[PDB]
Nucleic acid binder design. Sequence first.
DNA 1: GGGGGAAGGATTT
DNA 2: ATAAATCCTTCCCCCA
Length: 341
Amino acid sequence: MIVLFVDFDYFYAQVEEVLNPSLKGKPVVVCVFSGRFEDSGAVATANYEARKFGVKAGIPIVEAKKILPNAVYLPMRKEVYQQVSSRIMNLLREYSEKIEIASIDEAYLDISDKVRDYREAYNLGLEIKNKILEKEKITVTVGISKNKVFAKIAADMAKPNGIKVIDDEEVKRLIRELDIADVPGIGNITAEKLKKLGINKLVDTLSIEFDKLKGMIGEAKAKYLISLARDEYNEPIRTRVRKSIGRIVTMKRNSRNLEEIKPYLFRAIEESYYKLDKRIPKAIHVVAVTEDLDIVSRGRTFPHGISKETAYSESVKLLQKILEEDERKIRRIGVRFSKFI
DNA sequence: GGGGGAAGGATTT
DNA sequence: ATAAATCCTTCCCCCA
Ligand SMILES: Nc1ncnc2c1ncn2[C@H]1C[C@H](O)[C@@H](COP(=O)(O)OP(=O)(O)OP(=O)(O)O)O1
Ligand SMILES: *[C@@H]1c2c(cc3ccc4cccc5ccc2c3c45)[C@@H](O)[C@H](O)[C@@H]1O
Ligand SMILES: [Ca+2]
Ligand SMILES: [Ca+2]
Ligand SMILES: [Ca+2]
Ligand SMILES: [Mg+2]
């Protein structure tokens, strides 16, 4: 199999640069203003200019403005970035019917029936980079390898504006030298658990007793890494079918007053049904971020579809189930629909 | 013992 | 101190 993976460079920030090229070159910071007080919220992402000084996705907008007080701060415009993404994702389809849109700025292409070797594939990668740069003025990074995992790892090594190929040869090398924490699907918690087991490279999973590995990181993960270590991993590229859709919103101020939260909750539901579009959910979940940032959710499933009206009533029931089973004040509140028909 | 499915916390991104 | 989704593990009914 030959898989070409595409990841848009500092997407949100870049899109802003595209709609305002004067920004090009200066440090740009896209933020999510939570409005609980002037400049509350976080940095969704920043371009490399700003990234260069520690301003990056995740940090508080306040911290940011301290390091780069004179950087361009813009509010996140998801809808806009969503539409650009959509235009680019379509250009990608021109190159393969077998495409797997993984995220708003990531796509997997199975180009097995398009090229014969990595040289051809590499070229196709450049063709694609030029197409997107031309059509949308957006730079991306291309990762190419035998499976999705390595195609992604490739992109990771090459971004920004790069392109890399990991041949069957280097794959083998990487299975022995790559820091296992850098493997897709392995976050801090798993990486940590692995370190404790003397497993720092993929290959290490082959020399450890399975059941001991399973008991630590779980059967799914254990199998996943082992298949990678055995150079046997090779899941097919598949159309992504959104299994759940929801919206979560931060409140002006903490609270556990059902009447003070409802607005946020309903708002979340509305934004959700709009996103649902045609999709009818049978399950619903309410999620709340408590004041100490712990997360609590309560849901319910129905034997039939759910009308928006139902969602409203039912979501309030769940909100209360939360409010009564947890004494902490709520900070952020959301709803999540799933099990579509 | 385990299929099957529901629920809630865990983990990744 | 943003936000969106999927992934494990647990509990529970019950097997014709
Ligand atoms: N709190 C956080 N801590 C660390 N990383 C974060 C945090 N919040 C978000 N991020 C990550 C997810 C962001 O939406 C992602 C953003 O941007 P982009 O401009 O595409 O990046 P990129 O190409 O370097 O990486 P990527 O595509 O993986 O997101 O950075
Ligand atoms: C959102 C959130 C938080 C922490 C992290 C940490 C590392 C991340 C790496 C890549 C992507 C990413 C996306 C969202 C994150 C990330 C990361 C928390 O601080 C916060 O409470 C949210 O869960
Ligand atoms: Ca990207
Ligand atoms: Ca990692
Ligand atoms: Ca908890
Ligand atoms: Mg990405």
